[PDB]
Amino acid sequence: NIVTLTRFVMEQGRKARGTGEMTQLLNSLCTAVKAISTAVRKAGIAHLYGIAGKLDVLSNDLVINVLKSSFATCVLVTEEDKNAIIVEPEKRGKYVVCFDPLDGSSNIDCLVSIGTIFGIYRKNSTDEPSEKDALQPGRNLVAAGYALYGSATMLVLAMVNGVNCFMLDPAIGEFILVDRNVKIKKKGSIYSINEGYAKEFDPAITEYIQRKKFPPDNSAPYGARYVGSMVADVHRTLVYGGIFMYPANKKSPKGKLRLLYECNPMAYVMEKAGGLATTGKEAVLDIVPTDIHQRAPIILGSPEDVTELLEIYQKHA
Amino acid sequence: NIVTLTRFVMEQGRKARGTGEMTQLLNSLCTAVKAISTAVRKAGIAHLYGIAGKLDVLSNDLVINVLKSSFATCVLVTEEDKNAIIVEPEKRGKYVVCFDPLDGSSNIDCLVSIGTIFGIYRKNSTDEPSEKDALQPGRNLVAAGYALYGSATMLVLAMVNGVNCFMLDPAIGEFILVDRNVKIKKKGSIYSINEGYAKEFDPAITEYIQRKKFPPDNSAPYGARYVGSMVADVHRTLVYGGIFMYPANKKSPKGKLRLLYECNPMAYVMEKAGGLATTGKEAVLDIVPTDIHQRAPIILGSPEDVTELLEIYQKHA
Amino acid sequence: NIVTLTRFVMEQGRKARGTGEMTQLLNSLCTAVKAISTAVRKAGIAHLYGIAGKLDVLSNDLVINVLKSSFATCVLVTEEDKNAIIVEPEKRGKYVVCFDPLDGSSNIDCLVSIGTIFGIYRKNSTDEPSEKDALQPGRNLVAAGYALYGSATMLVLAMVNGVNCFMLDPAIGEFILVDRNVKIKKKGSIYSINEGYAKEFDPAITEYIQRKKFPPDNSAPYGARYVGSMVADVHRTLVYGGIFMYPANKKSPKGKLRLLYECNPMAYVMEKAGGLATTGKEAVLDIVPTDIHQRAPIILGSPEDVTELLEIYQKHA
Amino acid sequence: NIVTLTRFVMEQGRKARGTGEMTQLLNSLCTAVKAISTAVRKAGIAHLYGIAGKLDVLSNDLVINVLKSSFATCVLVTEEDKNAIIVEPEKRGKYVVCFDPLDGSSNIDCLVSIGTIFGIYRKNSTDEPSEKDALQPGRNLVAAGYALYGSATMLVLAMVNGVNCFMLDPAIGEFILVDRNVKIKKKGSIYSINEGYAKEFDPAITEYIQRKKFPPDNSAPYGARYVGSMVADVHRTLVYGGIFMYPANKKSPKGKLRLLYECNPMAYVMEKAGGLATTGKEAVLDIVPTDIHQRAPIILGSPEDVTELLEIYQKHA
């Protein structure tokens, strides 16, 4: 009575009376993620070192060809590509997929946890597919999630019904369901932000951080954690509780994180888990994109922590 | 031509004219690390989940059994065991090994990078082996290093002639030398500390951090990173430069990190790489321990960043 | 444009407008076979040898629980179980599955190629499921095939549309389609039989063997090969051409190979590949079983070789 | 307590007081075999099949590069190379290694068991190293053995003190000693020969085979097995008992199997295990070669079965 991702995705496709097109897409994703996981953990490196006489790029190529081979997609948006990828009519399906094939790639040389992020939209309209099909607010996501290549490889999948966590068993190449209908804690005890940008923070962020270090009601201060890889920091937030923040600063007054393939998928997982995701002014899922590589500030995590910061944001309104 | 850890270790043992006792110890360690890496990556998890037919206890049991079978050790100090472990005479060798089998075990459920830390001493006084044999300053280390289970598994080994990094190719179970004679950058641009303890920081730390966020000469502030796993944070420091700090506070008036199996091995690695490892008042390696589970404050990293902080400590003295 | 088993099985389920029940069954098989493959290649043996302080049976258990977890089966027949396994009504599906979880298990200690064999029937009737549901001639098979754990792991799947070969990539745990719509050679140059039973052969087998060693028309003699594991010998027959034989002798005047889970699946693969499978008197697929563990003589392979022996069988009629 | 090949090899090199040169050679071999096993099992095949981003040539290139880098060899003889390979002086050691990188390469497409055979000689006459250095009788071997890529990967190493079997645990990339000081049964019950050459067999062989099928004393006839892969057939002989034969015929008036890298290593293994290895007229190991690619007839296995056949040869002399 063990549940594999392949079994789960199929039972769910059957409960929803799907034609099996989204099921083929999710299955292709599972496969791409397993292939990326293997390359990240360096299987075969001995060959590069001459035993018998990139990563970001290889990841992009893997996701793009495996997804195109699903015959379920029409428009693909990648952080690595300037322009959206329109699928050849022969393999054109109805889904639009937005992804960051390898997030935190700058951490690659340090061997810190990295990951893959994706958001799936249904093409809403009937004209020739194009970039415009991707420009949907995150509220229209059919599915979203991410894979974390950390001490172990995990796939977190968020759909209308909720959030589920699948652990990769690399011995048999199968994702096993380990956590069902995951719900984030109402209040955590960890805050996560790059405090190296202190001089640049707006007054509301500055004050919140201060409340966390020197609590006015004399409660225990929060612990700090900042891996520097969104997927690692968010996954920790989901599982442990707390808050993650990447607000605006000189690094663009618009934030650093990209809306379509970084913020939306994560905001979607968070909301399905019972938490919040805001830019400080509005909910991330409601922003209407105007550019596929548009950035946006984001704050996400346990609802009580997110609301507390929102209140401060109001005080400085 | 490729160099595996196995060949490198033997070659070095040949040049040093050893009786092959330390060579066996080092081969044993390598085997234990590969075994732990496999467990950490979750191979075989499907069996816990009933495809019909604890990670730190297992790790501890792997290091202990595998080290004893090397017939090269007489005293073992584990973070997991209260008293030192005296090997039976039949299996006695001349080495004392101090290790943390799985560090960052809190971070396990969140899939954050974890690692194994070890330090190797040679039995000095030949009386019946005992706990006191482990009570040697870190300056007396023969070898030290760590295994990081991050996006990929890496083993860093430091000995008198330098520091070398070996990446694990899990396809063939062999560590390949990928970085030779490693040296840390003189000056970095990342600081790593849990600022959630700001309320309890002594003045020197407070000044240094603030100097990093608001550089007097309006230069770029340092970026911040704090994984919460020493092996991860220290490895990023060695590889990319910067400074790592875990000073004394209230909950830990003498620091949290233990001297024999966390601070010493890392201080040794940092020193051979050209960095510094201080308590703020003194070099970590010169401290003569009095308890096997003793704690110590530690600041390590690029020489220029550590020196700068030390200048500040002096100023408040 | 790579085809995985998971993709293939789904497209085929969709072309056939299945409810997705047989698709879930085939997917469970893929998973069980990957798990058996891993245990056969000895992953984890170090643990049995005390690194930190059956196979036939484990295989049976794996197939039985994974199949029962598919919710697509009602009756299971295993070589390892005296009685057929009736599925608990909660997980009862409509398929009957006959399998040998690990064939050639006596070769296990010698590390010779071994394999798994299965035949799938649709329950034909409407009363309580029972052993009687399995007693269908092989001509009523919906699907049949086998997995060979040899120098590499391969899954050969035979369905109404033909035979396809899938190679297991153990790095990503995915079966990849490597040979489509496989057809056996009309005439091969290898014969396979245990000649240690010479004294026991009937006159027709005796004469055929003689024709192969000393060809009456002076053509080159055939080469001999007999691995001793049916799946290995049959797979070689399919891929290379030729004939495989296990006729009657003192080892039961009825042959050794079991009809339901050894001969039928193989006879079915052979026929779909364009070859023949006979007991010498009748086609294997047409025999009406009377016992789930009933044995039957079998001869299979390239059509021209099988007909030649059948002619001799007639001459001695 | 567990014994890995790495530890065993070093331990034996310590007891023998070697300079560690052969120890390095043996560690190199182990690494090369693990690499070949991985390629053979087809890891990464999905890449040949375009998840977008020869086995004997590769094997040959792995053994050669990996052996040269051991700095322990001066002359290499491969089944794949016409002339002996003279290592550059910079990498010269004192050992001559004769090997078949991938034996049974015909059997590759059929996924039948394949293996690697090697024999190690010590350079006797210290003149500039050359081909003649490999032309030593098998009685002069320092070490020999083979790696079998069957259902599991095994390495059999024979040296003056005996034969030991090591099973590869692919999860941790380590060979574990599983059978110590192996000895072959005195008398077996399986004979292995390609009876497809019956027409060309000399009288002695003819009589022996017929004696196996129709034992004069009406005892049980011998079972027959002929995988077609020497490593597989010879390994089953060593492990289960019996006799393996590849005598001279017409297509091969001096046998098919080569003396330096197929017959000698196996004869050496058989002898240390308590079996016999003869040409029919003489012991294989006593033959002084005159060509590096020389062929030789070979009969090996349990002493009683081999003796019996030898008695028969004598009778027809």
Ligand SMILES: Nc1ncnc2c1ncn2[C@@H]1O[C@H](COP(=O)(O)O)[C@@H](O)[C@H]1O
């Ligand atoms: N495996 C699945 N899991 C959950 N929902 C699914 C699945 N397949 C299809 N659906 C749902 O049904 C809709 C159409 O399915 P489809 O015909 O495959 O495009 C989707 O867009 C989802 O809303």
Ligand SMILES: Nc1ncnc2c1ncn2[C@@H]1O[C@H](COP(=O)(O)O)[C@@H](O)[C@H]1O
């Ligand atoms: N593998 C090696 N690598 C570096 N130094 C070695 C090695 N083996 C032995 N040595 C050194 O030589 C001393 C004695 O070696 P041993 O006889 O093996 O106990 C050791 O403590 C080290 O200082």
Ligand SMILES: Nc1ncnc2c1ncn2[C@@H]1O[C@H](COP(=O)(O)O)[C@@H](O)[C@H]1O
């Ligand atoms: N994946 C599949 N591949 C080939 N045929 C299928 C598949 N699924 C179902 N079928 C066929 O359709 C019938 C009923 O499918 P099902 O509703 O799943 O039981 C089967 O018994 C087959 O004949």
Ligand SMILES: Nc1ncnc2c1ncn2[C@@H]1O[C@H](COP(=O)(O)O)[C@@H](O)[C@H]1O
């Ligand atoms: N690992 C070992 N196992 C068994 N014998 C060894 C080992 N190492 C060296 N010897 C033996 O000692 C001789 C010289 O060793 P060496 O100095 O390494 O070249 C060898 O030829 C073998 O006879």
Ligand SMILES: O=P(O)(O)OC[C@@H]1O[C@H](COP(=O)(O)O)[C@@H](O)[C@@H]1O
């Ligand atoms: O994948 P990218 O585009 O290289 O950047 C990773 C992102 O960069 C953020 C950290 O940026 P800072 O260094 O500015 O904190 C992380 O949350 C995100 O993963």
Ligand SMILES: O=P(O)(O)OC[C@@H]1O[C@H](COP(=O)(O)O)[C@@H](O)[C@@H]1O
């Ligand atoms: O869980 P461990 O084995 O005690 O390790 C925790 C240690 O804890 C440090 C961080 O602790 P804080 O949460 O107090 O920052 C790390 O740098 C060390 O890995």
Ligand SMILES: O=P(O)(O)OC[C@@H]1O[C@H](COP(=O)(O)O)[C@@H](O)[C@@H]1O
């Ligand atoms: O799986 P089993 O029941 O142990 O037997 C294997 C079978 O046994 C036959 C060989 O039997 P002989 O030794 O009689 O040739 C092979 O074709 C079959 O795989």
Ligand SMILES: O=P(O)(O)OC[C@@H]1O[C@H](COP(=O)(O)O)[C@@H](O)[C@@H]1O
């Ligand atoms: O393909 P190779 O490397 O030449 O090996 C074939 C050899 O061939 C023998 C069998 O050959 P026959 O087909 O002539 O029996 C085996 O025993 C040896 O493995």
Ligand SMILES: [Mn+2]
């Ligand atoms: Mn990216």
Ligand SMILES: [Mn+2]
């Ligand atoms: Mn990114």
Ligand SMILES: [Mn+2]
């Ligand atoms: Mn620990």
Ligand SMILES: [Mn+2]
């Ligand atoms: Mn610790």
Ligand SMILES: [Mn+2]
């Ligand atoms: Mn069986």
Ligand SMILES: [Mn+2]
């Ligand atoms: Mn069987």
Ligand SMILES: [Mn+2]
């Ligand atoms: Mn070869």
Ligand SMILES: [Mn+2]
């Ligand atoms: Mn050969």
